[PDB]
Amino acid sequence: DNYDVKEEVRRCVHKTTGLEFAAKIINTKKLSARDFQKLEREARICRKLQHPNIVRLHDSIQEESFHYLVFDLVTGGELFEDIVAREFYSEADASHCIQQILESIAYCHSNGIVHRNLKPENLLLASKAKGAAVKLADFGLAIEVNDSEAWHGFAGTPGYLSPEVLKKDPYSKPVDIWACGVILYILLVGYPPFWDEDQHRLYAQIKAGAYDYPSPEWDTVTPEAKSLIDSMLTVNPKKRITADQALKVPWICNRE
């Protein structure tokens, strides 16, 4: 009885504090029954995650046949778009962009959540400002886990997927740091590290750890930056850098 609907999920504004929001509105009995019970799980998760770089869920409300989920409102569009936009980040803007995603990931992990579906098309910008914040979204594939590696199903976007998941090995948190390296890799040059036309040709290249730094583009990227990628695109999970560790690197610890 507080929120007032606007255009379109769809916007809305609190009656008291008048702060714009985004309200996802689901249906009964569409979505079906246990289709709904998949959103049960999913929604619980976003409610554990209250962090500036995570599209925070603020309230969950059951009406009659419709369900309401009040989310942070983000407008700068997808990070994907901003990347095709500018072609590729500078190391500075890149350092900044990745440090934001890292802090969000870090928080997720230090809270038992693994994203899995971490990609550019799932990172939203506050605005297209020259400093705007980045927000994490889409927890459809998110799962809650202990420090113990298992085989938590097989899902994620083909291209960002981790070796350990293609080898049907047990995996945990570091599947996300792998995705980062892919992203951070893209930011610096605007093409992917692993890619082929044939899906299997691809997974092969991934599993293999097959990526390089083609000249001349990479010829002029600070080694400190490559090294940070190298350590995210470490094929052996056990030794692939963690989030809280990546946040302590020079090439990220340089606000000046």
Partner: peptide, 16 residues
């Protein structure tokens, strides 16, 4: 090597 720029390639897919 090279692969197409992220603009040219398009936007993900997802897998289950």
């Amino acid at each position: 090597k090279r692969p197409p720029k992220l603009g040219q390639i398009g936007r993900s897919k997802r897998v289950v």
